[PDB]
Each structure stands twice: as structure tokens, then as C-alpha cells.
Amino acid sequence: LPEDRSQHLGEELQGYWDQEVLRAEKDAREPSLTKAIIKCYWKSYVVLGIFTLIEESTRVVQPIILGKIIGYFENYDPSDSAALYEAHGYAGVLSACTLVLAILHHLYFYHVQCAGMRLRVAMCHMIYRKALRLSNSAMGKTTTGQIVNLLSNDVNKFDQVTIFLHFLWAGPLQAIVVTALLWMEIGISCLAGMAVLIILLPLQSCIGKLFSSLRSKTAAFTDTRIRTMNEVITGIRIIKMYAWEKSFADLITNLRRKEISKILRSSYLRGMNLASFFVASKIIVFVTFTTYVFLGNVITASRVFVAVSLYGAVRLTVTLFFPSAVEKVSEAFVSIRRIKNFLLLDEITQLMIVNVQDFTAFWDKASDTPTLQSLSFTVRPGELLAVVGPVGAGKSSLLSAVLGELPPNQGQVSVHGRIAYVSQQPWVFSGTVRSNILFGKKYEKERYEKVIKACALKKDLQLLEDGDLTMIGDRGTTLSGGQKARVNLARAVYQDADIYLLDDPLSAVDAEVSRHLFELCICQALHEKIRILVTHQLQYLKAASQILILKDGQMVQKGKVGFKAYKNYFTAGAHWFIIIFLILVNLAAQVSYILQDWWLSYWANQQSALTEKLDLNWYLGIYSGLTASTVLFGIVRSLLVFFVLVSSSQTLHNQMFESILRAPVLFFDRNPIGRILNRFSKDIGHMDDLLPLTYLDFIQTFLQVIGVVGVAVAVIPWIAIPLVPLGIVFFVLRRYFLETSRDVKRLESTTRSPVFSHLSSSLQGLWTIRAYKAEQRFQELFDSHQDLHSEAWFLFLTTSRWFAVRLDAICAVFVIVVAFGSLILAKTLDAGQVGLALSYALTLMGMFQWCVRQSAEVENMMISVERVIEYTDLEKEAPWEYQKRPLPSWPHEGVIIFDNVNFSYSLDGPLVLKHLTALIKSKEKVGIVGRTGAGKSSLIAALFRLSEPEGKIWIDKILTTEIGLHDLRKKMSIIPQEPVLFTGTMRKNLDPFNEHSDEELWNALEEVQLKEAIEDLPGKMDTELAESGSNFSVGQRQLVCLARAILRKNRILIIDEATANVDPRTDELIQKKIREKFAHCTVLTIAHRLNTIIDSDKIMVLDSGRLKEYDEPYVLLQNRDSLFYKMVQQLGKAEAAALTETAKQVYFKRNYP
Template sequence: MAKFSSELSEQCICQALHQKVSILVTHQLQYLRAANQILILKDGKMVGKGTYSEFLRSGIDFASLLKKEEEVEQPSIPGTPNLKSARSRTFSESSVWSQDSSVHSQKDGAAEQPPAENALAVVPEESRSEGKINFRVYRKYFTAGANYFVIFILIVFNILAQVAYVLQDWWLSYWANHQEKLNVTTNGNNGANETEHLDLNFYLGIYAGLTVATILFGIIRSLLVFQVLVNSGQTLHNKMFQSILKAPVLFFDRNPIGRILNRFSKDIGHLDDLLPLTFLDFVQTLLQIFGVVAVAVAVIPWILIPLIPLFILFIFLRRYFLDTSRDIKRLESTTRSPVFSHLSSSLQGLWTIRALKAEERFQKLFDAHQDLHSEAWFLFLTTSRWFAVRLDAICAIFVIVVAFGSLLLAKTLNAGQVGLALSYAITLMGTFQWGVRQSAEVENLMISVERVMEYTELEKEAPWETNKQPPPEWPSQGMIAFENVNFTYSLDGPLVLRHLSVLIKPKEKVGIVGRTGAGKSSLIAALFRLAEPEGKIWIDKYLTSELGLHDLRKKISIIPQEPVLFTGTMRKNLDPFNEYSDEELWNALEEVQLKEAVEDLPNKMETQLAESGSNFSVGQRQLVCLARAVLKKNRILIIDEATANVDPRTDEFIQKTIREKFAHCTVLTIAHRLNTIIDSDRIMLQASLAFLYQVPLVRLPWNASGFDSVVLRSDKRCRQVDQKIRGW
């Protein structure tokens, strides 16, 4: 969009902002004529300062560069964004927004939002389950950490630990009752108050044995519970991670990064931290209730009278509470995702936020997201307190009933039974309400398990590897054939390619041009199978749909428009799988003129790069991507406007390197500027989901989908170049 760039410079910067201080950072030198001062930077230092006319008169290399740019202004294919500007679209997001250009800031990577109506359709609200937690979730959670035999052993040790604990209390009661009977018998026979001593060693030995068994079984139970549940959390995390890795690209475009981070942070945190402790506490409390009730009923059968209505009331109250609490917990988990998303996007776009002085607006937006989440969290806390207060009130009533019942039945009960009844009543008062609360908390925490399991069952890409594997030297020629290919990014989405049939010959250099949304990047997406296309795509007589994704993608090199460097060393960025020797790596760096820059690093190729390679310029990062392609030596190379964001010299060098190093390769170039595709053997002009022309540039019709306007909008020198190419 040369016209758009000119209008932006003239009407916005020179007219609307003429009373403002404007700083233009650019490598489009033709716009510098309007600048009052020009600063030339090299290697982080200012090497020149002056006005436009002063540089023209100085006769230095920069002046000749200015003259060259003044004479030849690179035109753009009509309808495409001016990728020389400070923004550029990335491949992955433009592939989804085939009808709208999706652009990224070079500095902060913040993507412009597509139109609202499209955003509503493409970025749906986060899914939220309703109703009870399915039993399948419990079963999968426990079996993820252990097999059924280990789970059976775990249940046995839980029961043994509780039995040993209950037998301690029962043995003390038995000991006291037996001693009381001996006292009564002695008084009745002799008339004197004499106490017949029991075998103290026997009773103490039994009690000590039960105590040791309780401790031993309790330790084994706790270790087993934590081992099983921690393994479950780790297994589910790994499954979710593998599922995310195998998810199609569309999943990441439909789900903001905060939504994914929410599952990996808070939900996994619940699985690792709160759930094991809460579950162990619930199991201990539940078994303690069963044990206490069993002993109490065995010793004092009438205690069942208040216990049965108490149990029914607790079950009803728990069900009533969970119907509300469960959905509130799901709502709290869902409202947490926008907080993560907003924080992530704010950090990525921090430069833009500060430049536009939008800190206060973004802070208010963050506060709004945080307030919404806090409201859900506070509502969850208040419902929990409501539940706890009512449980405590019911338990207090239960103790009062037992106490007055003991008074009414004082003649039929001995002292040990009354003491045991009151002791168990007080114990049940705490354990009953705590057990019900913990059971509700376990079910609420299982929502995190449910959310994690949703991500373990995501739709997956095609298999990474299949039984049909091509030979190691494939593709040996680089022939690509599209046969009646239809392509869409989702089953319910529109077609972005329709009935595409193209034959690209071995070693052919093809330029792909067209208006924004015509489907240029979609052709590359279909080739990489970012979504499964209809029809057939052949590479050297192998049907790509029958190959594993790894076998296919590793044989196609791509130089993206937005260069990507990963956190790690330079060596790992060039050779992540340790496939090449140091000599090959240095040779590749030398071929792209990066050897000196890497040698100047503290640890050379072992130097840790900053996040996203920010300690390298955009041009240097693009050269690293070029070095990767040089190392791979694949027969097919995809270039997605690789020189859009670099200066003219780096642009010229990259084009020269591609012509020399990939002369024997099939090269597909997505282009927005004429000079990028001048050397192509064939031009594919794309419009309305189909290719209108597939001919050499010299045979491209003058009025080919607005191609004539490109030349007419250019200056005199550019028209002369174009006419010379066409042989006029």
C-alpha cells in the first residue's frame, strides 16, 4: 500500500501532527525528506546528524542511498498491508484471519483485534460445565495415579488405621468397665473397700500395641494417599501438556493465552496442593465418623435416635449447598482467566501502553477483571460460611439432645457409658460438620480436575508419525501438486481456498501475490496441514495426508515474516536437536553474516538469549531464521515476506542469499512488493479464494486484478523497470 503509506505520512504526520514533536523510526528513506533533522544510527551509536538537504550535499554513502530511494520507491501489491511499517502480521494469526489482516507490533507483539463480529464468532466464551461432578472424573483422577490394586491397598490401610484408632478408645472403655466390675465384686463379697488389681502389663501391652498400629497404619495411609494423588496430578499435567502440543493451531487462536495459563497454574496448583490435603482430611474424618458411630451404637444403642435425623439433615443440607457452591466455584475459575489474559497482553504490549499513555485505562480494565473475579471468590466464601454456621448449629443441638438423654436414662447407664456417650457426642459434633464441609470442598476442588481433563481430551492434529514414512532423502526433487484442494480452518468456518489445482515444478521459484484475505497464507497453511484440507496435495509423488506431521513439516523450511527466537542458547536456536557439528553451525552463521555478531557474545554460541531474542535486532533475528534454513538444506523453502521488516541493505542481502543458496530448491514466496518476486519463474496472482493467473511475470496481463495500478502508482523509475521486464 504505497498510496496508504504516502497518505499516512503526508496527512497524519506532516499535517495533523505538524505542531507535535514526531519521531519517525524507519528504513523507508523516501519519507525522510519531510524531517527537520535526521539521525543515522549504527551498532547502537549515532554516526551522522543533519537535514535531508545536508546529507544530499555531503556525498556520503547515505546520500546515494537517499537518492536511490528517491528514484525508486518500491510499490506494493494492491490491497496488501504496507509491511515496511512498524507493524507486520504473523503467519499463525493471519492464517486464521484470512479475511482480515492480523498484525503484530515488532516490539510488543500485541495483535490488533479483528472486528467485533468476527471476534465473537472466533473467540468463544470459556466453556463451563454444569451440575454434579461426573463419577468418571473421580475414576479417571484416581486411576491416573495408580492401578486398581494399589487403590485397593490404599482403602485397606485407611480402614486398618481407623480400626486401630477406634480400638484404642474401645480398649480404654473396656479396661475401665472391667476395673469397675472388679471393684463392685470385691465390695459385695468382703464388705470392705478393697480393689483387686488387674494385670496391668497385659492391658498396657494391648493399648501400646494398638497405639503403635495406629501410628504405623496412619503413616502408611498418608504416604500412599499423597503418592497416588501427586502421581495423579503429575499424570494429568503431562497429558494436558501433550494434548496442548498436539492441538491444532485454531485452538490457540480461539483460546487466549490467559485461559490456557489458568489451567496450568491455578487448576494444576489445586491438584498438587489443596486437593491431596483436603481429600486425606476428608477420608480420615469420614472413617472416624464411621468408627465413632459404630462404637457408640455398640455401647449405647439409643444414640441412634438423634443420629439418624442428624445424618439425613446433613445430607440434605450438603446437597442444597453444593448445588450453589459448585457453580459458583466454576464461575470463579472462569472469571480468573480474563485476569491472566489481560496481565499477559499488558506485559507484551507494555511499550505501546506507555507510548500512548494508556496506563490508567489498562489499570482500570485490570481492576474490572479483578473485581469480577473477587466478587465470585467472595460469593464462594460467603456460601461456605453460611454452610458452616448451620452445621455448627445442628451439631450443638445434637450434643444438647445427647446430654439430656443421658440424664433421662441415668438409671440404666453406668458412668462409663454416659462418659462415652458425651465424649462421642462432642467428637461427632466436630467430625460430622467438618466431614460434610470437607466432602463439599473435595467436590469443589474436583472442578479443577474436571477443567484439566477437558484439556486432556482436546481435538488433536493428525498423528505426528505414521506407518508410511518417506525415504530419508525425500523430497529429492521438490515437486508440489495441489489437486482440487478446498481448505478451511474449522468445520464451521468459511472456505479460504476453493478448488485449488496447482502444479509447482521442481526447482521452480514461484511468487504468490494477491489482496489481503485472498488466501496466500492459507495455501502455506494447507501445505503444512495446520488444518486438514480436502483434496490432494502431493510432494514428489507422496500424498501429504498419508504422512506423519513430523515427517512432513521437518522437510519444509520456512522463513517467516516475524522472526522467532526461543529462550535458550544460540546453539539451541540453530540446532535444537544437536544434528549438526560446530563447524556446520559456524559456516551457516558466516553465510548469513552473523558470525562476527555471535563471536562477540560472552559465551559465543552458548550465550543465553533474552526473551524472544530481544537482544538481537529484527534484521539479525531474520538472519538467524535464514541460517536455520541454510542448515536444514531442504528441497522446499517457504518465504513469507521475510524482508518486510528489515532495512534495504539487509533486504538485498537476504534476497541474494536465497538466490544463491536455494538455487536448486523449490521456493514459494508470499510477496507484497514487486522487487521480491521479480526473479520468480512464475507468478500466482490470487483473488477470491482462487488463483487467477499462474504465469511468468513477463506474461502477467496488464489489468490482472489491479496489477496495472501497481505500476501506474509507482514513480517514473519504477515504471521504467517494470516496462523493461516486460520487454516494452
């Protein structure tokens, strides 16, 4: 509707906010955003408020009319037909109150949602209006996430507050008036009940604080686990080859052991909160009626069950809703104050030729130096200015100065004509790549195609699946970097400005593309235009009309889940006996809950059947027992669900983690790191932190719904006939709703993230989108994405309302059946029985909707459990240890034999080694040579049995097939292709099994000459390394990987580019260290820098299929028909000459030796 779409709805609130800034400027006070919101929406809040007034009035009137119905039975006489008519009157009024609440909820459930959405959508408008106009200072001291958190979090508070806000008055007023009504019904004993009620307020508030401390304290372990698990999952191939699986197992078990201790202790406090909500009514009624009878009053059914029904009214609003409102209105005011701050944040000022004179600027006046100083320049049509200089020269400060984003500190800047800007970091928005080029301009195909061909972009637009109609993600994720760079320039070239600002786009592309862009676009296409080009591509500079060189900031030069999933989730947590015990204690909790209320009905009947008086010792004694058993079972049941379900979450994580460790590497190839880690971060998260609560809350309420129906059918058995249709309706109604709702619920979620992602993209682009003065267009696109989500959300609202307005209709019917049916059968039953029937009947709505709501949340969250259960059942590597284990001296020589070996990364996959058959002699030096991925990397995966080979691999006449994987993998030393360090001690990275001497460690750390860094690091070998050891250089990480091999003594060493991350001199020196440290080893080297292997005793040359050469490299080089000679000949003449000279000399010496 036009009255609810974002532009109209937001523009009015902004009008009030500015007027609250015009006021408090015509006045010395500061502004209030709360005044602006209130002054805008008070007309809606009032009607939201009147519903609460009328609703809470009827909820209090229901108990009083219930008293009139029961009063029919307390003095029943079948001869008074008029009394029967009058009871039907109140039975009518009690029905009307019931359907009134249904309609009030049906209206209120609409207007609260619409009022909340309107306030949210108006706030979204003002926040995004600012984001297009933030100062570039503010965009420094604030971040993309911190602004998006406004939309993604702080604004979502407002439509929660609009629900609860009026309970901040309705709660207190109801507690007062219900206290007054209880006083008229009971007398002073009503205070003893309310004393408990106002104590559960602080007591539940305290448990919330104590829980929040444990919930805060446990998050440190969770992040430590998840970060450890992330490096475990990321590094898995290196973790596997080192056999360090037992090390990271013992880390994760200790992290998980400590974490679940906190999750259990926090969960028990949270079980105590829900136990309080369950027992609260029973304690409140117990202390009330105990004190009432001790004052000598006698229990009669009307007074009791009116009073019990009144506590049922005030309890829920005072204990649940009033604290929820005070909490969420606190969240409101922190959000309002945060949004007030952001809306007041610094803005961009309200700012053919370019002319700049005496120009100086500071990004921060607190800087020790200017960020630009004493610049001056001017440039005019047909001129190209090239801007040149080192890193930190100020080049990007100049262009952002000319664009006017960096204001001048001194001097002056002026421009005439349109300015184009292309940013070095390319930027793209959710839309067609064509839209990413047209940027809202009219589409003209010829200038467009000229742009495409001038940008040499036609191929990429022909390769995209839907062509240039391919939707690009809000960060360009479906383009390559070089496409989005060229797309980002193509935009500016279509916009055809008078002045171009180019911030080094020519570095985002190859020299050929760069010269194609520079020559064709910049020189030829922009030939008539002003250009200012910053670039590191100095190669063209003589083409520039003028050159400005900068340094240090100044100028230098100019020139649904199945039952089995539920069964496994419960059975995995505890023995079969405890789950039976869990069911019994759940039923025992609810049966005892009912039975004390039945006991008042029995006590009422007995008092009515009677001077003489009841023996209080019996009735009050049993009443104390039944109340106490509800407390005991209510507590025990709460703690035991949490124990069984958190214990299940402990067991299932451990089975899943052992499975993930034992998964074959192929599992981490076919599933990405994020999707695996999401099992541990989200799904185990729910299984720890939400699903146990939701199960307990569902179970607690569901048994209580069965309690209402059970009491009613136990007291009036003929109600079972009206209920079987009512059940049949409900089952069909739920089935129909869940079939249709799941789609609209998804649609309402999938349409929200475009709002945040459009903002998040719009923030990254702010420089360029404001450059074209595209603000107001990019505001309408937000209003389109916002008001399109509003449309999706409105369809969800009507769908949910259609269910709710009849889910509470079947509940309203149930009250009619009990209310009127009780009178139709009035001859059969006594007043206390009818009081028990109806006081339970009156509580059905509210909790019945909540029971069904919690059913949907359980059934949804169980998807997380099914998603972990699939990972308990992964395929496994062969056992770490077989029955046979090699003698500890093996390998004694390190002879490796390949025999007819084939390998494939999957048993369903193509072969990537075939018939590989070769002998490697002990102490022999072998180089592995061939095309990228042509067998080379598969050989390492085969030798370590990362995927099982076909054919036979022997080590010292042991078949590697017939021994445990840790026998094989431990007894071979590997220096990986990409080095990895793990977050922990330097010692844990050198010797996690703690089996090398500290003298040996230091000797290795000396032998790699890393000790200087370990002496520079404060903790020596015990120093805590950074994230992945980022404190060390990638070269130093290779030094650590060399040390590990030095420590791990083995006959067999495998090497893969192990030194390529090092400068050529230190690279070749640590190559010499390898020769010095492993001269005795059998060494297999995989490399591309043939200079690293030319001195091998043999080189294996692999086709992608087969071992084509395997011989002395000199003999291979003398075999000019070898691929080895062809390869060195392809490298070049001097390369082959150098290599062949080295080979000849070493071959002669090794033959002479």
C-alpha cells in the same frame, strides 16, 4: 449501615493516626500506627476477647461435667432415684454448655467478622487517601502493583488477625489451667502428656520451615516450566512446522520430572504435618496413661475420659490455633509496618495567565544534569504556545512543571485559572464513556455534543453497543487506543478550562484526525483560551502564537463434576490395586484410632470388674500396639494419598500436554493463550499444591466424624433412630445452603475486584485526576465501591451464619441424644462405654463444621480437575508417522502438484481455497501474490497440512496425505512471517536435535553475518539468549531464521516476508543471500513487497477463491489484462517501469541461458 460505611469508619481512624503524628511531634518519639489502631478499636477487641474468655471457659468446663455423668455409672445402683435425678442435672448442664458454645460461636462468628471488616475498610480508606496525594518522587520509587498489593494483599491480613489474636493469650492461659485441671484429675503424669504437646509446637514449626525451603526451591522449576510452556503455546504454529515438538516435549518432561520430584518431597513433609495432627492426640494420651499406670495408678473410666476430653480441648488450641495466631500476628506486624511506611511516604506539596521564570528542575538531585534548566516563559488568554524538540528535550517535564507536579529547583512558577491536562498515555476509569467525558460535572447535552463532534467522536459513540452508556473497563480495554485518546481529550474539552496543557495527544491519532483536532478543537474551539501544546506534530507550528524549542533539558530556540471425574482423578494416578489399598489403610487408620480409646474403655471395665490386679503386660502391650498402628497407618495413609494424588497430577499433566501438542492448530485459534495456559498455571497448580492437601484433610476429618457417630451408635444402638431424621435434616440443609450460597459467594468475589481496579486505574490517572482537583470525588467513588462490596459481604456473612448456627445445632442435638440417651438406657451399659460415647460426642462440633467446609472446598477445586480432564480428550492431528514412511532420499527433486485442492481452517468452516490446481517444477522459483489473507496464508497451512485439505497434494509423486506429518513437515524448509527465537542456547535455536556440525553452524552464522553478535555475546553459540531472544533485534531474528533454513537442507523452501523486518539495504542483501544460498531449491515465496519476488520464474496470483494467474511474471506483466499488471499499475508508473525492466532483463537472460 451508616456506622459501618467506608467514609465514617475510615475518617475516625485517620483522625487517630494524625493524632499519633501530632503526638510523636509534640514528643521526640516516632509515631506508632499500632497505637492509632488500638486506641480506635479497643472497645471492640475487648468484646471479641470476652467471648474467647467465656468460650474457652465452657470448653474446659464440659470435660469436668462429663466426669460427673460418668461417675453415675461407676457406682450405679437402680435403687437411688435421686442419683438418677442428679445425673440428669449434669446431663442438663453438659447440654447447656453445648448450646452456650453454639450461641457464643453464633455471636463471636459475627463480631469477629465485623471487627475484622471494619479495620480492613478503614485501612483501605487511608491507603487510597494517600494514593491521590503521593509525591511524584514517591510514584517513581513505588509502583502501581506495589501500592495495590497493599489493598490486594497486606490489608487482607487484618481480618485474619482479628480471629486468632486473642489466642496469643487464651492459648497459654488455657494450657496452664488445663494443666492444673489435669493435675487435679491425674497427678504428675499430666506433665508427660504436656511435654509431647509442647514438643509438637517446635517440631511442626520446623517442618513448616523445611517445607517452605522446598516450596521456595520448587518455584524456580515451576516458573521455568510455565515460561517454557508459554513460548510453546504462543509459538505453536512455528513449533509445529519445524517439527520440534519432540524437543519441547523433552524439555517439558525434564522440567516436569524435576518439579514433581520437589512436589513429592515437599508433599511428603506436608503429609507428615497432617499425620502429626492426626496421631498427636493418640501419642499424647499414650505417653500420659503409660506413665500414669507405671506409677502404680489404676485406670478408671471417669479419670481417663475426663483427661482425654481435656487433652481434646487444650490440644486443638495449643497445637493449631496458637501457632496460627503467632504466624498471622507476625504477618500483621509486617503489614502494619509496611502501611506505616506508605502513609509516611512523600506527598505532593500543599501547592488568567501562566508565568514561569528562571525555571530549572531535577527529577533527581543525584542526576548528573538538570532535567530542565534555565527555562522562562509566560502565556496569556488567546495565545497558543507550541513546545517543540527532540526526544529527551524535556517537553513532558515542562508540562508536568507547569501543572506543578515537578517542583522548581530554581526560578518560579505561577498560574491563574483552571488548568486542563491531557496525557499522552490516555486514561479512562470504570464507568460510562459518557462519565469518562463528564468526569462528575453536570451533564449538558449541547456542550457535550459539541465536544463529541469537535472531537469527531460521534461515530465511535454510535458504534458502541449501549452507546455512550457502554461501561468502559478500568483501563479502556473495550475502546480502541484512538477512541480512548479522543475520549481523554473530549473530557478536557468538556471541562473547558482557562489553561490547556496538551502532551502530544496529536500523535495518538492519524494526521487527518490530528489536523481535525488541531484545527477545529485547538485553534477554533480553544481560540480564546491559553494553550501550551507539546507535540511532535511540527507540521502546524506556524499556527502557534509562540514557539519554544528545547534540547537536552534546556531552551534552544524561541520564535458439580460427576462421579467419573472423581473416578478418573483417582484411577489416573495409580493402579486399581493401590486405590483399594488406599481405602483399606484409611479405614485401618480410623478403626485403630478408635480402638485404642475403646481399649481404655475395655481396660477400665476390666479394672472395675475386679487382692489381685490386671497383668499390665497384656493391656499395656496391646495398647502400645494399637497406638503404634495408628501412627503407622496415620503416617502411611498421609504419604499414600499424597503419592496417589500427586502421581495422578503427574499422569494427567502428561496426557494433557501430549494432547495439547497433538491438538490441531484450530484449537489454539478458538482458545486464547491465557485460557490454555491457565490450565497449566492454575489448574495443575491446584492439583499439585492444594487439592491433595484438601483431600487428605477432608478424608482425615470425615472418617473422624463417622468415628464419632459410629462409636455412639456402636455403644447405644437405639441412637440410630434419632439419627436418621438428623441425617435427613442435614442432607436437606446442606442441599438448600449450597443452592443459595453459591450465588452470594460469587457476588462477594465479583464485587471485590472493582475496589482494586478502581485504585489501579486511579494510580495511572493520578496526574490528570489531581489536575482537575478531583481527589475528594474520586475518594467517594472508592467509598462507593468499597461500601458496595461491604454490602455484598454482609449478605454473605448472614448466609454463612444461618448455615453455621444450625449446622452446630444438629451437632448440639447429637450431644443431647448421647448425653440424655445414655442415662435413659443406663441399665444397659457400663461407665467405660458411656465415657467413650461422650468423650467422642463432645468433639463433634468444630470438626463437623470443618468437615463440611472442606467438603465445599474439595467440590469447588475439583472444577480444576474437570477442566484438565476435558483437555486430555482433545481432537488430534493425524499420526506423526504412518505405517508408510518415505525413503530418506525423498524429496529427490521437489516437484509439488496441487490437484483440485480445497482448504478450510475447520471442517465446519468456510472454504478459503477452492480447486487449487497447479504444478510447481523442481528448482522452480514461484511467487504467491494476492490480497491480504486471500488464499496466501492458507496455502502454507494447506501444504504443511495444518488443517486437512480436500483434494490431492503431491510431492515427488508422493501424496502428502498418505505419509506421516513429520515426514512431510521435516522435509520442507520454512522462514516464518514473524520470526521466533526460544529461550535457551543459541545452539538450541539453530539445531535442537544436535545433528549439524559446529563448523556448519558457524558457517551459517557467518553466511547470515550474525557471527559478530555471537562473538560479542559471551558464550558464543552456547550463550544463553534472552527472553524470546530479545537480546537480538527483530532483523537479527530473521537472520537466525535464514540460518535455520541454510542448516536444514531441503529441496523445498517456503518464505513469507522473511526479510521485511530489515533495513532496505540489508533486507535486499539477505534477499541476495537467499538467492545465493537456495539457487538450487524449489522456492515458494509469499510476500507483499513485490520487489522481493519480481525475479521469480513464475508468479501464482490468487483470488481469495482461485488461482487466477500462474505464469512467467514478465509474460503476466506483458499481459496487461493480468491482475499482476493491474497491481503494479496500482502501485504506480515508476514501480511498474522498474519492475518490468527487471522482469524483461531477467526474462531475456533466463531465456538466453
